[PDB]
Symmetry: C2
Subunit: 193 residues, 2 copies
């Protein structure tokens, strides 16, 4: 039960490395998972629902990793603390590039994919703004822009720049340089007067 | 000749304020431009080509405005100089939100729209990096990140953040706050040690 479902998910993630969702059929997912077409429809209403679940799992993996960090501060300087946090997203989405690229494309068409992304982006921006606020309250960061507006632009920068790097878009920061590039802009814009 | 073409372009831009390209027909564009369907096909091969031309005009308007600025430096401080430059894009794309949103959606499907965007982004990043390099050569900015990598992330930040603000996405920086938000992050990341 959970086995056939996992099989369908694993097939979809494998097939998405090679072609987009449009070029993958329900019959394709069923065949890869070793089931018939009506059996597929018993676990998922559509191939698009399969992508939704894959993206949901990726998003929650990142969110849980970030929650772990939040409850277990690394013992290091401020620059390293922001790096560890951005690194959650570099590693989690960068470990699932095909789901990330397909999930990105699906935002234009799927209201469920758009709302899932939007919900978690609001959560990650709120967390970012809360940490900035904490840093200002402690006297470590200057009161410049509204924390929440700053947090919004920096998280949108990371969304676009990470996902261009993973897709090898032209232009993009090389994937081996993107973490350092992002950490620099976050630290200078959060702490710079 | 140029009149019927302009009429088709003006109709497409008006209709795109209300619905996406998918919900607009060649018959719709022809009717709005006061021509028949085969007459339309004489000026444009497809509705998608109409969007390509609209986006091409918007992109070149911005590029030309930025080239004007480049040849006519505003007499003001560094923070204001970057603001005037980002403002080219805030004003040009923000004056054409329907074309901007439709052009964005079309990158996923149209190789011509994807290549047009990519060509100009490479040009604007190269210009950004050249100005950063000039500022370092003069001793006004510190040698921190590779100028071109920094320029790439900052232009990708502006792409995503401006276009979220114009579309009223959730999350987004309000359009009345986005210019100041972006200028802050550019100046602190370019000049911050
Ligand atoms: O790197 C990111 N955010 C960094 C972050 C958020 C909270 O703490 C660090 N993102 C947000 C969405 C996709 C990439
Ligand atoms: O604001 C931007 N760039 C700012 C810029 C580029 C060159 O000088 C200022 N962009 C680049 C693409 C869409 C938005």
């Amino acid at each position: 039960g959970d086995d056939r479902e996992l099989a369908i998910l694993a097939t979809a993630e494998n097939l998405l490395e090679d072609r987009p969702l449009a070029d993958i059929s329900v019959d394709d997912l069923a065949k890869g998972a070793g089931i018939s077409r009506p059996t597929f429809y018993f676990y998922f209403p559509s191939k698009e629902a399969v992508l939704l679940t894959l993206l949901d799992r990726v998003v929650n993996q990142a969110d849980m990793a970030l929650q772990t960090l939040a409850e277990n501060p690394a013992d290091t300087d401020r620059e390293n603390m922001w790096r560890t946090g951005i690194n959650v997203f570099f590693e989690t989405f960068g470990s699932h590039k095909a789901v990330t690229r397909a999930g990105q494309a699906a935002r234009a068409t799927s209201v469920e994919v758009a709302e899932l992304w939007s919900t978690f982006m609001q959560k990650w921006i709120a967390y970012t703004a809360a940490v900035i606020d904490a840093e200002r309250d402690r006297g470590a960061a200057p009161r410049t822009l509204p924390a929440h507006e700053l947090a919004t632009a920096l998280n949108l920068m990371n969304e676009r720049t990470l996902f261009a790097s993973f897709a090898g878009e032209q232009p993009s920061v090389p994937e081996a340089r993107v973490l350092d590039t992002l950490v620099h802009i976050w630290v200078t814009s959060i702490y710079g007067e």
